[PDB]
Design a protein around this ligand. Structure first.
Ligand SMILES: [Cl-]
Ligand SMILES: [Cl-]
Ligand code: NA
Ligand code: NA
Lengths: 414, 414
């Protein structure tokens, strides 16, 4: 049985990371802000909040809007997530030293949750005004959900596959999983992978608010997202996009790249329980964690840290606590970054994978914000109050998305 | 180096197939119709054709509309592709003998190209009339593009992963590729996989017509789709959805299932050349074919049959001819089923994978319709005139989708 530990899979390392968040456009500044206890969540100033008198009046827009970096041409021929992908793809490649890699061994896997939905809705209009020949001959390349991965693959020259997984909140983690598979099966030696997602808008707020999935603690926006806290009342949206560069350790060594961490294994399972709610028993979600350990060659006792999915919904956090127990990982130090960064559906698993890498690199876990009253049904070791410095050797990042899509990624310190 | 031939990968067999097409809701009736030279392509009677005076006035609607099988409840809580997935998923399971499988070893991978786009556009309206609290609390489960795979996984009880790849015309083939990977890596023993796509509508016709990608031979609808013919003038839309059941040969034998064919290997590459046009040299597309042979343990000389992507665009067919040469497969007997069934983006690679299986099972390739004048730049052995009966031992199904996403699937006779 091949595993990373027994050499049956090639060693795969993370060599570069990039992200834009509600705290900062600079991932190292986001990290410093997280360690300092900062929140990206604020009162929403968007006109659509007062227009609709939305029950949710809080969220985290990007600190640095993507389109402040976009000229008129890009604004007209790319969807938002394509522009985000172009921005992050170029930043990542620069952070990696702009390496010259073999295109035929270079893959791109970028997930999204909702996708380029704004250009589809926009293409109807204009046609209803000027007919079919009005429709921008660029419409096809802006409307389909693989558009962001396609842009990045074309931008960076990836000819070993350009893939887009769609699994709601787990899309960005699942993308990293498939990139890892593409390398360990021998199809690629290097891959850009992660997730992108559109900005906070009225329709997603209304759709998820109508499920009672979202916090309405509008008076104290920074205190609203309370993963695993007894007083939690749902998730908060916080915008993000994130990409990482992974490659075989041999490929990194050959080009002088310094690894930030090891990507050791990935598990993908499904609840087949409900179209939006997670299974209360946490069993299939825990088994995604177990599968990542099997492929890494690790035991539950090796796992020092879990970067929780931790959305702060009542049922979601309870399910994940059961999952962590099922996987034998309930002695791990737990961080719930959505406490500070909010939920970004298709991007957030990639963002949290980057955070897991930084936790292993720096030996420190930021505090879970607003964790003030342990929930009795949640008996987890949640890092809180101030950063916990620790000898974290191995970690699992969880992403358990709406629909029961479970992705767990196993990382190790380099 | 593991291969299927050397036992490094477990043997994987196709045990059941289902499809709905412009010829028939019954895959075996579609097959008989193809062999008889039937076309699913007709004059479009939709009001939107005359409303917009579209340049394209032809296409193939499903012979049996999905919603003729859908009650009021399903019509209101599922997107079209979710309803198609539910219909095909139930038909497939019945054709397989309704087996009781281990949920924890059962995966679902279903691709789509455009997805549940109609429910997103629909959710804006109603909110603009009655506000956020009007928005159907079922909106979330109807709007995201993983919705069809989620429905099928919940319907059939798949707990070893529920995945949705998005790669335009290659999505349905890529789904089968990822399902094969999920089994040969040990994550599942059985998987339902394929692709689904919405019906012919005005906006897709206008978007692809504006690229000059579509035939306008409106006077003779059945003669319009002419893959590899000198007089071809673009593709024709033909609706479809298709799923197959794959499982380890040991799993099939244990439950008494009779395999229809073997799924031996899958290659996924990318052109990184252009956002919609394929690379003229066919090199990366050919390498997807080569990769499928490497993983199967086959040589180009083993390939008796290629089920071409064959859209009938001028540049697409020329690129694919180069790809088949690059892969060393230009002595294979070539079929282009879009000649009779048209193009169904996210579903069509799955449909053509089913057809490849039937070709191997029955030792016969249907005629490529409208192939009357070989193109000098296309020197391929295209089956035409009447079905060619032959000793087909191994075959490759190609899907080379817009954006340069190349998927090749290697199948063998059982
Ligand atoms: Cl602590
Ligand atoms: Cl012939
Ligand atoms: Na996480
Ligand atoms: Na084909």
């Amino acid at each position: 049985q091949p595993s990373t530990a027994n050499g049956g899979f090639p060693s795969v390392v993370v060599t570069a990371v990039t992200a834009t968040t509600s705290i900062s456009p600079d991932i190292e500044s986001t990290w410093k802000g997280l360690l300092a206890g900062e929140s990206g969540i604020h009162a929403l100033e968007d006109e659509f909040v007062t227009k609709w008198d939305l029950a949710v009046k809080i969220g985290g827009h990007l600190k640095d809007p993507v389109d402040s970096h976009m000229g008129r041409l890009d604004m007209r021929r790319m969807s938002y997530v394509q522009r985000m992908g172009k921005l992050l793809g170029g930043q990542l490649w620069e952070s990696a030293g702009s390496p010259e890699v073999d295109p035929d061994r270079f893959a791109v896997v970028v997930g999204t949750g909702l996708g380029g939905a704004e250009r589809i809705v926009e293409s109807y209009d204009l046609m209803n005004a000027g007919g079919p020949r009005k429709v921008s001959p660029l419409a096809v390349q802006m409307i389909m959900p693989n558009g962001a991965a396609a842009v990045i693959g074309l931008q960076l020259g990836a000819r070993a596959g350009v893939m887009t997984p769609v699994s709601a909140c787990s899309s960005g983690s699942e993308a990293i999983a498939h990139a890892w598979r593409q390398i360990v099966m021998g199809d690629a030696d290097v891959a850009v992978c992660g997730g992108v997602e559109g900005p906070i808008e009225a329709l997603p707020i209304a759709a998820f608010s109508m499920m009672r999935a979202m916090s309405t603690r509008n008076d104290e926006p920074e205190r609203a997202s309370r993963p695993f806290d007894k007083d939690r009342d749902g998730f908060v949206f916080g915008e993000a996009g994130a990409l990482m560069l992974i490659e075989t350790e041999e490929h990194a060594k050959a080009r002088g790249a310094k690894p930030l961490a090891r990507l050791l294994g990935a598990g993908i399972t499904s609840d087949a329980f409900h179209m939006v709610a997670p299974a209360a028993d946490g069993v299939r979600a825990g088994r995604a964690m177990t599968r990542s350990l099997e492929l890494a060659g690790l035991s539950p006792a090796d796992i020092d840290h879990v970067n929780a999915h931790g959305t702060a919904t009542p049922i979601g956090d309870a399910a994940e606590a059961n999952a962590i127990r099922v996987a034998g990982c309930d002695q791990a130090a737990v961080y719930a970054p959505k406490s500070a960064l909010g939920h970004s559906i298709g991007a957030v698993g990639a963002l949290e994978s980057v955070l897991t890498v930084l936790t292993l690199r720096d030996g420190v876990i930021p505090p879970t914000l607003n964790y003030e009253t342990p929930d009795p049904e949640i008996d987890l070791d949640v890092v809180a109050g101030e950063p916990r410095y620790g000898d974290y050797r191995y970690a699992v990042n969880n992403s358990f998305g709406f629909g029961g899509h479970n992705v767990a990624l196993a990382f190790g310190r380099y």
